[PDB]
Copies of this chain bind each other. A is one copy, B any other.
Amino acid sequence: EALGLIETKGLVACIEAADAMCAAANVELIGYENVGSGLVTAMVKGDVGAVNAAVDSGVEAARRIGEVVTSRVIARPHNDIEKIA
């Protein structure tokens, strides 16, 4: 199960990124994470082919609304790398 991540400057661009990821491919929204400085990350789960398509589409949609700081697809993520606590 690949992990898809999109980090934006501001929440509204992140909500748009998460919505566009869910509409583009069969991915599951894990949730959002905020680390301060306006940085918010949307995290998705699914097959590597679906995650790559979802992230590519999510970045394109978020760039029209706000600023995308970074994006990433981790094909084989290690245990608990998505659990930030």
**Number of residues of chain A lying within 8 A (CB) of chain B:** 44
Q: Within the assembled complex, what's the spacing in Å between the Cα atoms of A34 and B16?
A: 16
Interface of A is mostly: mixed
Looking at the assembled complex, report how far the CB atom of A84 sits from the nearest CB atom of chain B, in whole angstroms.
5
Q: Does A15 contact B (CB under 8 A)?
A: yes
Q: Least Cβ distance of A18 to chain B in Å?
A: 5
Residue among A3, A6, A11 having the largest count of chain B Cβ atoms under 10 Å: A11
Q: Does A41 contact B (CB under 8 A)?
A: yes
A interface residues (Cβ-Cβ under 8 A, vs B): 3, 5-7, 9-13, 15-16, 18-19, 22-23, 29-41, 65-66, 69-72, 74, 77-85
